[PDB]
Each structure stands twice: as structure tokens, then as C-alpha cells.
């Protein structure tokens, strides 16, 4: 298994480093350009902040877990379960954006009163706490417990499948993801109707931007859904051949992929970022 193992170990670290560089460049761009310091974007950081730590921590974790290394069960679950707290603080941010964009476009006139710096910061702080609670509840006691005090760590053996499908997927991922869908659908279809008869120019522009942040949400789902849908079959259908390891490894990575694309979309769609990305590459690296 010296060959097959290896393609994985690289494609992973390749992605791990993209995620550090792509999302540090986001977080830098915001620190720099005032025009970027707005509520909507503090959530796009909290998202970058997370997709960073996927590269620094989650992927290394995903690689040592890959092998089936030995550890005590509780000090083991943390490696298994730290990707989950990050996945969570992704969805909280992705949703916080979608609602910020609902308010801004459906109820423009009250956005000022309603959305502010201070509140955004608090929301972000709260979510990170929940994200930790939700991420590593298996550490809390909902867990499944070489060397006599140790345990061979394989995700599907220390993290329970019923926690993975009910409390992680149905509850904490599929729901926010759906009602994200509910929220964007109402913004775009409302606007389609509203544009046809009637600031006309301004609506188009703040919509266009939403379609951009919506496409982010789109891809998160595309990236995670395959893996979650497998966790469903693996559990709900035990009278089914368990998905094979090549398809397993695919969707493990496919997921890690999501931490890379976010910065490329900001660049390919959103001028204010593209311009701040350009200017950082021009002034700080090329000089």
C-alpha cells in the first residue's frame, strides 16, 4: 500500500497549503482596506479564520487518523472531532451572511438600525462557543470506547454514527443549509418580480453580490453532501455494502477542497477583493 496511500497524503497537503495561503490573503485584505471592514465581511473572515485552521490542523488530523494510530480514546476523539467544530463555525458564518443579505435587500430601510459592528462580533463569539460544544460533544460523553491503555483510532469507531447522522447532519448541517436555501430563494425571486416593475440600479448590484456569497454556500453543500449522504447509508442501511475506501477517500478530500475555493470565488466575482488581492501581490510580494 506504499503507492496508493501516497497520492492521498500529497493531494491532502497540497490542499492544506492552498487553504492557508488563499484564506490568509482574505483575512489580510479585510485588515487592510476600510471598504472591506463591514458586517457582511466580518462573517467572511470568521469563515476564512476556520478554512485556515483546516489546513493547519484538520488535515494533519485527517492524515494521522487515516493510518489508525494508537491513543487514549478521549485524547483521540479531539483529532477526529476538531474538523466538526470548524465545519460548524463555517455554517454559522455562511448563514449569518445569508440573513445579513436578506435584511439588506428585503428590508433595506431598517438594515441601519438592525445590523451593526458590535452585534456581529458578539454573534461570531457565541457561534464559536456553540461550534466547540457541537463539534466535540463526543468528547462530552457521547463516544464509542496495540497497547493496554490505548485504542486504534479510526473515525467510524470512536465517533458514533447516530451522533454523525442525527445531531451533526440532520440537526446542525442539513437544516441550516436548507433554510439558507429558503432565505436566498426569497431574496432572488422577490427581486426578479420587484425588478420587472418599479433604486433599480442599486438592487441589481447588491443582488449580484448575494449570488456571489450564495455560490459559496452552494459549493459548501456540494463539497460536504456526498460524505454526509454516505454516513446515512453506512448507518440507516446496514444491509448495504459499506462504501469502498477509494470513494471514502474521495469525499474526505472533496470536503477538505471547500477550504480552498472560497478565496478564488471572491477573486473571480467580487471586484473590491480582486483589487485588494492584486494590490497585496503587487506591493508586498512582487515588491
Amino acid at each position, epitope marked *: 500500500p506504499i503507492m496508493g496511500s501516497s497520492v492521498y497524503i500529497t493531494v491532502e497537503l497540497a490542499i492544506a497549503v492552498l487553504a492557508i495561503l488563499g484564506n490568509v490573503l482574505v483575512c489580510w485584505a479585510v485588515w487592510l482596506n476600510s471598504n472591506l471592514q463591514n458586517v*457582511t465581511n466580518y462573517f467572511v473572515v470568521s469563515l476564512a479564520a476556520a478554512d485556515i485552521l483546516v489546513g493547519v490542523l484538520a488535515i494533519p488530523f485527517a492524515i494521522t487518523i487515516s493510518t489508525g494510530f494508537c491513543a487514549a480514546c478521549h485524547g483521540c476523539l479531539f483529532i477526529a472531532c476538531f474538523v466538526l467544530v470548524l465545519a460548524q463555525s463555517s455554517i454559522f458564518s455562511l448563514l449569518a451572511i445569508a440573513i445579513d*443579505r436578506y435584511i439588506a435587500i428585503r428590508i433595506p430601510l431598517r438594515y441601519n438600525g438592525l445590523v451593526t459592528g458590535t452585534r456581529a462580533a458578539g454573534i461570531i463569539a457565541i457561534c464559536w462557543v456553540l461550534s466547540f460544544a457541537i463539534g466535540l460533544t463526543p468528547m462530552l460523553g457521547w463516544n464509542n470506547c496495540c497497547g493496554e491503555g490505548q485504542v486504534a483510532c479510526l473515525f467510524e469507531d470512536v465517533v458514533p454514527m447516530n451522533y454523525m447522522v442525527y445531531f451533526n447532519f440532520f440537526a446542525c448541517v442539513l437544516v441550516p443549509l436548507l433554510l439558507m436555501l429558503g432565505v436566498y430563494l426569497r431574496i432572488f425571486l422577490a427581486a426578479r418580480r420587484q425588478l420587472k416593475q418599479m433604486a433599480r440600479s*442599486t438592487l441589481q448590484k447588491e443582488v449580484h453580490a448575494a449570488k456571489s456569497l450564495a455560490i459559496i454556500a452552494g459549493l459548501f453543500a456540494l463539497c460536504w453532501l456526498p460524505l454526509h449522504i454516505i454516513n446515512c447509508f453506512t448507518f440507516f442501511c446496514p444491509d448495504c455494502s459499506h462504501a469502498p475506501l477509494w470513494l471514502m477517500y474521495l469525499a474526505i478530500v472533496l470536503s477538505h477542497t471547500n477550504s480552498v475555493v472560497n478565496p478564488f470565488i471572491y477573486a473571480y466575482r467580487i471586484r473590491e477583493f480582486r483589487q485588494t488581492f492584486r494590490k497585496i501581490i503587487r506591493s508586498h510580494v512582487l515588491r
Partner: antibody
Framework: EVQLQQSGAELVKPGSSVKISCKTSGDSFTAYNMNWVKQSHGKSLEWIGNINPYYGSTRYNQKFKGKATLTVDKSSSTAYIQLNSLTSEDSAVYYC?????????????????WGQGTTLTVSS | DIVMTQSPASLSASVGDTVTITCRASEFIYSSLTWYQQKQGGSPQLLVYAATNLADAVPSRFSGSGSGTQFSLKINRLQPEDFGTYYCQHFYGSTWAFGGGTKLEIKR
């Protein structure tokens, strides 16, 4: 379309003060910042400051800190500016202008609607 | 505080010819710059916002361009109505300024 209707021309002694009106109408006054702009010598255009009419928080240009004072009466949808220790350097046209704002990734910002302006003439 | 530099201060031109006006920022303001038109005894009219965006009811013959420090407004096909003074203004950060302005005049 916000409709901005300012007060009429003033003529005041040096050392005196003066409070110009801007009555907004036919839109949310509290939804967007109300700015002031000084046109002096017929061409020169300075930014005086703005007020967030909801919170009544003010950002002033350094130049006009300790001259201009941005107040707001929310019930009537009226923004004020008071100018103190008036000297002949103060004699100019002052405009209220509404600051549009939306998100395309950044905070977009433009003075879209302007008052008819107001002539302050200071002489002893 | 960022200084804007507008040029030319004055410029004369016949109806139906093309013209351009320049605005330099003393610091990088990205695309945060607005153009306005003032006719004799009128208020500023918003002309272009966000460096490149035509305000509604501004004719299509008007258009702005640029990013960072150098921004120009081009008026394609001058009409009688287009004569007047033109100003640029930045909206970067917490404290803003205008240009000196540009009196467009009739050439004879």
C-alpha cells in the same frame, strides 16, 4: 426619492451663531447618514461631517470640528447644523446631502440627493 | 487627510466633441470615488458613483473609469446641457474630500 428642503439665506454678525435646517421627506430619514458640504469662493467644496440620524452619532472633518455641530430631530425628519463664533471665513453656501450605501463586497458610498443649499453671509 | 487633485481646472470645447477630466488621490482609494456635475446656481448632481457606475437618468454618453490613485470621467458627445463645473470626491475611510473642480466651457 428623498426630498431635501433647507432653510433660507442668513445674515449674521461676527461672533454670532446660526442653525441651518434640512427637512427630509418621502423616505426613511433614519435609514442613511445625512452629510453637510461647504461650497466656498464659488468653486471650493469641503466635507463638513455627517450624522447617523438613528443613533445621532457624528463624524466631523478635523477642519470643521469646533465650528460645525450636527444635530437631528427624528419626529419631523429634519437634520440641523449650527456654526459658532462665526467669522467672515464662514460666509459660504452649505448643502445637506443624503449618503446612499449598499454592499457589493465593499461599502459603496455616494451623495445621491442634495438640498437647494443655504447662503450664510457674515459681516459687521 | 487624503488630498484629491483634479485637472484640468478649466477646459473649453465645442458641442459634439469628446473630453476627459482627471482625479488623482494622494493615497490608494481602490474604486471609492464619485463624480458630480454643478450647473450655474444649482446643487451638485450625482453623475457617477463607485468610480465606474452611471447614476440613473445620467445619459450613457457619460462614463467614469480607473482604480487606486488615477480616475478619469469621459463625456463622449458634448451637448449644450453638459457645460458646467465637474467635481470628483473620495469615500475611503472616515474623513472625505473633493477635487478643485473642472469648469467645462464653450470654445469660440
Amino acid at each position: 426619492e428623498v426630498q431635501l428642503q433647507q432653510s433660507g439665506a442668513e445674515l449674521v454678525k461676527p461672533g454670532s451663531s446660526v442653525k441651518i435646517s434640512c427637512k427630509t421627506s418621502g423616505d426613511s430619514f433614519t435609514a442613511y447618514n445625512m452629510n453637510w458640504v461647504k461650497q466656498s469662493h464659488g468653486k471650493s467644496l469641503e466635507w463638513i461631517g455627517n450624522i447617523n440620524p438613528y443613533y445621532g452619532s457624528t463624524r466631523y472633518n478635523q477642519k470643521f470640528k469646533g465650528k460645525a455641530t450636527l444635530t437631528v430631530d427624528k419626529s419631523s425628519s429634519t437634520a440641523y447644523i449650527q456654526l459658532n463664533s462665526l467669522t467672515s471665513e464662514d460666509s459660504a453656501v452649505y448643502y445637506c446631502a443624503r449618503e446612499g450605501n449598499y454592499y457589493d463586497g465593499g461599502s459603496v458610498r455616494y451623495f445621491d440627493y442634495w438640498g437647494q443649499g443655504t447662503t450664510l453671509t457674515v459681516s459687521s | 487627510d487624503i488630498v484629491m487633485t483634479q485637472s484640468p481646472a478649466s477646459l473649453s470645447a465645442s458641442v459634439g466633441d469628446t473630453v476627459t477630466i482627471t482625479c488623482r488621490a494622494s493615497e490608494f482609494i481602490y474604486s471609492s470615488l464619485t463624480w458630480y456635475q454643478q450647473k450655474q446656481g444649482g446643487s451638485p448632481q450625482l453623475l457617477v458613483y463607485a468610480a465606474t457606475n452611471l447614476a440613473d437618468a445620467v445619459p450613457s454618453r457619460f462614463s467614469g473609469s480607473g482604480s487606486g490613485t488615477q480616475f478619469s470621467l469621459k463625456i463622449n458627445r458634448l451637448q449644450p446641457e453638459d457645460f458646467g463645473t465637474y467635481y470628483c470626491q473620495h469615500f475611503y475611510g472616515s474623513t472625505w474630500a473633493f477635487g478643485g473642480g473642472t469648469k467645462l466651457e464653450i470654445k469660440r
